[PDB]
Design an enzyme around this catalytic site. Structure first.
Site, PDB file in Angstrom:
ATOM      1  N   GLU A 111      51.749 -24.222 -13.437  1.00  0.00           N
ATOM      2  CA  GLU A 111      51.571 -22.924 -12.788  1.00  0.00           C
ATOM      3  C   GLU A 111      50.621 -23.113 -11.613  1.00  0.00           C
ATOM      4  O   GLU A 111      49.403 -22.971 -11.736  1.00  0.00           O
ATOM      5  CB  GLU A 111      51.044 -21.901 -13.786  1.00  0.00           C
ATOM      6  CG  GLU A 111      50.896 -20.502 -13.230  1.00  0.00           C
ATOM      7  CD  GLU A 111      50.210 -19.559 -14.201  1.00  0.00           C
ATOM      8  OE1 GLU A 111      49.664 -20.034 -15.222  1.00  0.00           O
ATOM      9  OE2 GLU A 111      50.217 -18.338 -13.942  1.00  0.00           O
TER      10      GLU A 111
ATOM     11  N   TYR B 145      28.344   2.767   2.057  1.00  0.00           N
ATOM     12  CA  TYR B 145      27.614   3.898   2.608  1.00  0.00           C
ATOM     13  C   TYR B 145      27.579   5.116   1.703  1.00  0.00           C
ATOM     14  O   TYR B 145      26.741   5.998   1.923  1.00  0.00           O
ATOM     15  CB  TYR B 145      28.205   4.316   3.964  1.00  0.00           C
ATOM     16  CG  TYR B 145      27.924   3.332   5.085  1.00  0.00           C
ATOM     17  CD1 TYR B 145      26.673   2.749   5.225  1.00  0.00           C
ATOM     18  CD2 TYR B 145      28.915   2.980   5.998  1.00  0.00           C
ATOM     19  CE1 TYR B 145      26.411   1.846   6.246  1.00  0.00           C
ATOM     20  CE2 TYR B 145      28.663   2.076   7.023  1.00  0.00           C
ATOM     21  CZ  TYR B 145      27.408   1.510   7.138  1.00  0.00           C
ATOM     22  OH  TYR B 145      27.142   0.610   8.145  1.00  0.00           O
TER      23      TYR B 145
ATOM     24  N   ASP C 126      47.671 -16.277 -20.513  1.00  0.00           N
ATOM     25  CA  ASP C 126      47.634 -14.850 -20.241  1.00  0.00           C
ATOM     26  C   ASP C 126      49.059 -14.313 -20.095  1.00  0.00           C
ATOM     27  O   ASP C 126      50.045 -15.043 -20.226  1.00  0.00           O
ATOM     28  CB  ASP C 126      46.786 -14.549 -18.999  1.00  0.00           C
ATOM     29  CG  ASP C 126      47.197 -15.364 -17.787  1.00  0.00           C
ATOM     30  OD1 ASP C 126      48.331 -15.887 -17.760  1.00  0.00           O
ATOM     31  OD2 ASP C 126      46.378 -15.482 -16.850  1.00  0.00           O
TER      32      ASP C 126
ATOM     33  N   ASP D 258      48.907 -20.686 -17.812  1.00  0.00           N
ATOM     34  CA  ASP D 258      47.802 -20.008 -18.476  1.00  0.00           C
ATOM     35  C   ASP D 258      48.300 -19.248 -19.697  1.00  0.00           C
ATOM     36  O   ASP D 258      49.459 -18.833 -19.771  1.00  0.00           O
ATOM     37  CB  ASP D 258      47.112 -19.030 -17.528  1.00  0.00           C
ATOM     38  CG  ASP D 258      46.398 -19.723 -16.395  1.00  0.00           C
ATOM     39  OD1 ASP D 258      45.652 -20.691 -16.663  1.00  0.00           O
ATOM     40  OD2 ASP D 258      46.579 -19.292 -15.236  1.00  0.00           O
TER      41      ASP D 258
END
Lengths: 729, 716
Positions: free
Chosen positions: B28, B359, B109, B107
């Site tokens: 992967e 901000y 997952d 993986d």
């Protein structure tokens, strides 16, 4: 009616009519700025005010094609709203009445990006109709930079030096509340209404005061004045250095001021945009770091992680603790790059690459997701940056948050350890890696008064050669040997040549040929690991003999040139400086580092003495209580304090010294009841003597002795770490 | 013999006469290939090949042109020397393949399982006879490692079983490939037998692979997920807790790939208990743990969420979750849990007109911890992301928050849309349920909405704005329907009326705008004839001031984690009421034990100070061992709070001896004695109060603050 075709425009009700000269068009930085203007305008303000959001990049007219200018919707939309004709004169009030709006007010953030929009808009007006600038046409909306609130009382300052003057003139200033309003979005809608009720205190007008303004605008935006901008930044940095040495404040543009010249705006506000790119891309010579790297390192120091954490978690911590706002992808790369330890990366990685952090196979790009890779400080990081020096550094503020320092001051010049690379606006930096032990030795030689030995670039675990052809000019070579006729072995590539890139760009074309070159080799086989390179290449016997006579290193692209002619770094005062040699970097570093060992000693002397005095009172207090000279059981607090004062006990000496750098008996009575037991009392008594001896030992040591101690500690850990690295490979 | 033109492939040396013993590792991405390369070293290149997968197409649901225009699959075919029309049912044709096994290294997952399944689907569609033999395999790493001594586990229950023995050593989770170092990769590749698993056992596997990737089996996957959630719900209600060598294709589909489809459902559809999605809960949990008494920048808070809650989605997604939790404009939350201190977006642009996160500031609303009381946190189930404790499965607020701020989400098979309802009506209906009365019907209600909401039919509503005729040529629009934004209405409705379409003339003469950031005022001019015609048609219809709202897809996760469709909002209220009442019983049970431990602790602390003042205990110049023996002889207790907490999961007298000498002074002794009385009275008061009494207390506290907060909001 109203103009058709501009749905994003809040057209003023009197625009395009008899009272058009009394109308003001507000150009805002995006939709959020327009919303703030709308909140303040209410209903009464909608008759003489118009709001239009600039949702795109204003083009630089000076340096853009006429086709782009004629097809730019943003530029055309402004034309329709103001009623401006591309070729016209506006020196007579007769020709000023064909404009739907008598004024244009630019509303942006008070950051560098907002100043860029202001200037680009100014450049657009100046280049098409420099007649409008002559009269009061272009203006800007300004909010106070700082607001102080206490006991329902509010005051505002329009300049950071003005706020500092208030603090210098106001005792108990730390009892107020401080908020910074450079960004428009910081202001609430309620605050927006307050601003528009007093527009005189929130409006500034751009004044044309002579051809100097035209020169300023030309200097900032003309494509032909690139070299002039370099001298413009060069003088700015030297002027900043002189201003700080003379005690003058930073160059302010707004006071409690109604007019700002175009020349003043360009030379004091728009200049900060270009200098920011240099300040973000060019490292400091003191620690070899850029501000983004420093923020990551500062976060790691503050966390003091004893166990590894995911990079994604550390990235969140950096954003939380250092006010990093340059992007998630940039933050991830900064963390990852600080940990890489493959050939051509850092000679001494300050972060540990626990997981897949990229390798020499792909130049560090083959790293895994930040949610799966872990990191923490290297055991050398706090030896290189000793904690005792933190008290002599200048820590910066992002609004109300204390963040990373201006620079750290490591024990050896880190800029020469892992090198430096960066491209700014006018300057570029490229410094190679150098041997850690050689740098330590040269620092020791300077301490003894000897001349530094010459240093060649050195890359950890590199198996090739680096040769100096001429001063600051080097050739880095890989390793190739002839196994037999028809076979050669490539066991090392030059620094920064990656395994996958070499196979794809060099060896594949020699095997397959191209449209312009027949194949040179018959086969090749790969025997690499993640950290070593091995190519075995087969060739025709005659073709190999030809290649050897030409040179295998040249034929197989195993040579790379390296020139040290652009070693540009920020010096300790903040001025870009071109260093001619790496010895000049070392000498400049040596003077500063030696001075800061004197600063560390002075601070340590005061702090150790305060600690000794504190422990002196604490040991006496426990002993006196046991002896009965002091009774605290069931006694009033006020009576106890009087006894402590009468017996000559001191207020917290560490606290007293810290306030002295700019009574309290809690340090005695906060002590646990454990300290009345024999064993803990003995520990407190022993600690009192140890602190006194520690102060005495320090008094007998020069700053150079302290430096040598730090170097010896670092070298010992360096040998341990590097030996373990070899054993694990 | 030699493959040409694939520069990213690390071909095995024997790939050849020994092709049967050659294994191709499909990785992967480049990082996975790097791990495999590190573990292979030099000697591993003879029988192993590595190729990085830089997305496998769904062969069933794709054009055959794309199935031949995808370079990735074509490169895989070239590397493994595969022929599209071949059976290879015996070793006669298995030697026509360049490699003996295809190994998928991804993986652990959901994204990795998708790659694994799609590769399996690729083999199943074009060479079904190849998945029968020992051909396709997967690379597996231990799920958990414990570390100068190190042990590894390939099973989570085995790791839990390890805890029964002795659980602090050091624990790390290796689901992601990138977690393993190059040194660890070499260790894996030495004992490759323990890090390799092989995949056909019947016709059930063909159905499993077909179910996951067939474009026509969409509704079967929905029932597939429905059975999974219901089975999980029953196991959790029964209190149940929910390595091998070979894994069947059917097992992989039904036990691993199932987590991918429910993940979209679990991330998009909120829970009925707290009205939150997991991302929102992570932000709120971060805010609760921080307990900021002063406003903080959104950018700073976002970093805290990433650090504290293991949030691993987009940064832009995180920023939007925080901002959306604070918005308080018409159509947004009826009760914002976060304060919008700055430009957080308004009704002008539907909340999109917010400023930069560096901000704008935020902090908890004063109502948030009144709605989510801290005393309930000790009864919740907090989740773990690997080794980090994170947000719970849900919070349990005092009123059903899902009806306060509504719910919206699109999953895989289900969708959720719930309108907002009035806080005071919900509080009143909760009070009625506590008294045994029937709940009153509730219509959707949006805070500060000046229009009307009418129910035509059950769960069918019409929301309308306000329009008034001023004179023969003028009308004023003072309200838009809920979720109609001012800019969107001006651009989509009024602009076309002013300009006309290509084939339709203008409808209106002029309009004038008088909005604020929170109110709408359009003054529209028309001719007399067109206005009269508009009146006959209906001004609300003509000016698009009406929107339909149907409560036919009120789908939420129940407290057990199963998607449930609620027919009425009263069903949500009743289901919430029963759970919340039960957790008020759970809170009282916890408080009884904790308050008792605190009282016992203070009793020992007050006794210790008084005895020291009275002289019954002497500690001056005494050995620690002698002092401890005296405390035991006098019957002092080890830390009761520590003992009670240990009970809920020599002696300890640190809580006594850590007390400062200040406590020997008169005032502090009196304060300690006063605190000793207060804790006892608190326990006695609690014993006389029912769970409903505690609920009523929380509601009254919340209501008092709600009036104060809402009054200040009107004052501005």
């Amino acid at each position: 009616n109203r103009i058709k075709g501009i749905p994003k425009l809040d057209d003023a009700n009197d625009a395009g009519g008899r009272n058009s000269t009394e109308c003001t068009l507000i150009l805002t930085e995006g939709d959020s700025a327009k919303t703030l203007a709308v909140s303040g305008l209410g209903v009464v303000g909608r008759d003489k005010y118009g709001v239009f959001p600039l949702r795109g990049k204003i083009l630089n007219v000076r340096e853009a094609s006429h086709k782009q200018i004629m097809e730019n919707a943003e530029i055309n939309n402004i034309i329709k709203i103001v009623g401006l004709q591309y070729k016209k004169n506006y020196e007579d009030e007769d020709s000023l009445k064909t404009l739907r709006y008598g004024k244009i007010m630019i509303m942006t953030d008070q950051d560098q990006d907002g100043s860029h929009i202001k200037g680009l808009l100014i450049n657009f007006i100046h280049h098409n109709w420099p007649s409008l600038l002559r009269h009061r046409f272009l203006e800007e909306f300004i909010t106070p930079i700082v607001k102080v609130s206490k006991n329902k009382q509010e005051m505002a300052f329009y300049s950071l030096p003005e706020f500092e003057e208030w603090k210098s003139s106001t005792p108990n200033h730390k009892k107020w509340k401080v908020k910074y309003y450079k960004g428009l979005g910081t202001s609430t809608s309620k605050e927006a209404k307050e601003y528009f009720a007093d527009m005189k205190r929130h409006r500034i007008q751009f004044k044309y005061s002579g051809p100097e303004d035209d020169a300023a605008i030309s200097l900032a935006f003309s494509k032909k004045q690139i070299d002039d901008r370099k001298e413009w930044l060069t003088n700015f940095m030297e002027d900043r250095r002189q201003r700080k040495l003379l005690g003058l404040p930073e160059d302010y543009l707004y006071g409690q001021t109604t007019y700002l010249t175009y020349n003043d705006f360009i030379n004091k506000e728009l200049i900060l945009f270009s200098n920011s790119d240099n300040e973000r891309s060019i490292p400091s010579m003191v620690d070899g770091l850029k501000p983004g790297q420093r923020k990551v390192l500062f976060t790691c120091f503050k966390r003091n992680d004893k166990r590894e954490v995911k990079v994604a978690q550390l990235a969140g911590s950096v954003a939380e603790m250092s006010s990093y706002h340059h992007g998630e992808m940039s933050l991830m790369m900064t963390i990852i790059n600080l940990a890489q330890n493959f050939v051509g990366s850092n000679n001494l990685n300050l972060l540990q690459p626990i997981g897949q952090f990229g390798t020499r196979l792909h130049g560090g790009k083959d790293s895994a997701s930040p949610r799966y890779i872990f990191t923490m400080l290297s055991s050398l990081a706090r030896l290189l940056f000793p904690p005792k020096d933190d008290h002599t550094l200048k820590f910066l503020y992002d609004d109300n948050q204390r963040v990373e320092p201006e620079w750290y001051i490591p024990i050896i010049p880190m800029v020469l350890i892992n090198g430096a690379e960066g491209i700014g606006t006018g300057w570029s930096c490229k410094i190679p890696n150098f041997d850690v032990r050689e740098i330590v030795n040269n620092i020791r030689r300077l301490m003894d008064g000897e001349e530094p030995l010459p240093m060649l670039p050195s890359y950890k675990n590199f198996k090739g050669t680096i040769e100096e052809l001429a001063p600051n000019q080097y050739v880095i070579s890989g390793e190739v040997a002839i196994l037999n006729s028809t076979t050669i072995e490539i066991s090392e590539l030059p620094v920064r040549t990656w395994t996958q890139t070499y196979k794809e760009q060099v060896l594949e074309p020699m095997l397959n040929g191209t449209e312009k070159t027949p194949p040179l080799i018959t086969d090749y086989r790969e025997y690499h690991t993640d950290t070593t390179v091995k190519f075995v290449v087969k060739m025709t016997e005659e073709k190999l003999a030809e290649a050897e006579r030409v040179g295998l290193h040249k034929v197989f692209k195993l040579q790379t040139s390296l020139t040290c002619n652009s070693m540009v770094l920020f010096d300790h005062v903040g001025c870009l400086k071109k260093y001619d040699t790496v010895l000049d970097i070392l000498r400049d570093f040596f003077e500063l580092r030696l001075k800061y060992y004197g600063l560390r000693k002075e601070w340590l002397l005061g702090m150790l003495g305060a600690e000794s005095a504190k422990l002196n009172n604490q040991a006496r207090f426990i002993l006196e209580k046991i002896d009965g000279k002091i009774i605290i059981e069931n006694k009033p607090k006020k009576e106890l304090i009087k006894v402590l004062i009468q017996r000559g006990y001191d207020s917290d000496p560490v606290k007293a010294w810290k306030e002295a750098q700019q009574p309290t008996f809690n340090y005695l009575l906060d002590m646990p009841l454990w300290y009345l037991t024999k064993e803990k009392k003995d520990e407190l008594c022993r600690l009192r003597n140890e602190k006194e001896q520690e102060l005495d030992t320090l008094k007998r040591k020069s700053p150079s002795d302290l430096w040598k101690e730090d170097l010896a500690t670092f070298i010992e850990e360096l040998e341990a770490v590097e030996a373990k690295e070899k054993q694990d490979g």
